[model samples]
Target: GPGSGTMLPVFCVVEHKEEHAEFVLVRKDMLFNQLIEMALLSLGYSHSSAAQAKGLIQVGKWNPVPLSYVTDAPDATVADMLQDVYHVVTLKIQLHSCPKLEDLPPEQWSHTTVRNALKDLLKDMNQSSLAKECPLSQSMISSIVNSTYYANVSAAKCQEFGRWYKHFK
Candidate 1:
């Protein structure tokens, strides 16, 4: 096989401007709607009057409870809720299509098998900037891929810590 000393940089920028715009519009209107209600109530207006004021301020019908309200649940309940949310998010992120062995670009996913993939990933992690953030015993990392939460996943935490590794890197 011919090999060149030259190497090309590979990069990907994942951007969803439309999704972000929806997020911003929802966030802004939600916050503005909540604040408008608070302001109107502070000035002695009824809920209906406050809602009317919201419409006047260009706030839409898509009113969402503020995060403060959502977070007001008991700490334990909130923690559990957040964990469920995290698991769902992780599962969604890890939904990458498994490339067929023959179809996979050898350069991008040079690892030929799971064993090699795991070994390469662990070595890369050891050298990654994220390596220092959290420390765990060797046993912990050993169990990570086979962790019970992921191992026993019921369509909720599929495949294991597959998505957790995506948090930063």
Candidate 2:
């Protein structure tokens, strides 16, 4: 083992699932991208597409719940701002990727996948505001969100979505 007692323990993060568990480790002043890249894919898989889909900001940055303020989440109200791992937290890991990739044009995706993706996106956008800026009409978006419509998807009022998604993350 290339063990060096210098990694200096700071935070060991984890989550308990119904039948399983997951984890991450953070030590010292390293920025998250450093934290993420250092041991990045040692045993886990799909980190690029994972961070790509959400973001270096949202995927790795937005997720940790500091231990000072989070039990179900984190106990700390701090931002982990400059991306260092010194903060503390009780947290959930979001954005873990499976076998996926960049350039995600959801129109050809399983309608099921696009459905949830759109719903999650709605968390950060507005149906009315998005409709105005996007080719997709408010009616169609509303219909899709409610399941009142079906998927022909190149029903072009929305190629903008996948494109928008690429930059937004």
Candidate 3:
């Protein structure tokens, strides 16, 4: 039974932090993404939706999911890791900002000039509401307006503010 390379459906216990645990039937030949996406759906989220919701744009270059299982070989599968009837896999998921923002075309305006422009643009509404209109978090938007992390924004982000200013105002 241990050495047999039979592909079977094995029960798995899936868990995520601050979320309830659930059970699923995992296939021995299933890829990591299938399991990850299923686990995400079970927890009221989909992979890309979670990314977009958190102001992170997916360039298709990276699909980041912080998931792992203990006592498993690197890149090993359920069939290889444990050919048992049941297993436990824990997932820790978070949306991370890609620091490669500068790769995009930069705004023609300077950072300080953009900051000042963003300030008035946000004057009518709060950061929380404005964040939905842009690909930035509320905190970072506030930081930009308040000049805390003023220099941290890339050309791509600066361009978003420019778009907002032109279209809305």
TM-score per prediction, in order, is 0.19, 0.35, 0.33
Which regions of candidate 2 are displaced past 4 Å? 1-96, 99-110, 155-160
Best by TM-score: 2
Local distance difference test, each candidate = 0.28, 0.42, 0.47
RMSD (Å) per prediction = 22.4, 13.9, 14.8
Q: Could you tally the backbone clashes for each prediction?
A: 0, 14, 0
What are the runs in model 3 whose C-alpha is more than 4 Å off? 1-106
Q: CA shift at 164, candidate 2, in angstroms?
A: 2.2
Cα lDDT tens digits, model 3, 1-169, are 4555445333322222222234434556655434454444443343453443221112123452233423334566655543553333333333332212222113333466567655765768777777887667888777777664568877777777655555554
* Superposed Cα deviation of residue 65, candidate 2 (Å): 43
lDDT string for model 1 (1-169, tens) is 2122222111111111211011111111123224334333332223454333311111133343333444444333322323223222110001122333222222222212322334446765762332244332344435444543423222222212223322333
What's the true lDDT of residue 105 in model 2?
Answer: 36
What residue runs in model 1 are displaced by over 4 Å at the alpha carbon? 1-96, 99-118, 127-137, 143-160
Which wins on lDDT, candidate 1 or candidate 3?
3
Q: Write the per-residue lDDT of candidate 2 for residues 114-155, one digit (tens) a residue.
A: 555567768988988777765567787776788835775553
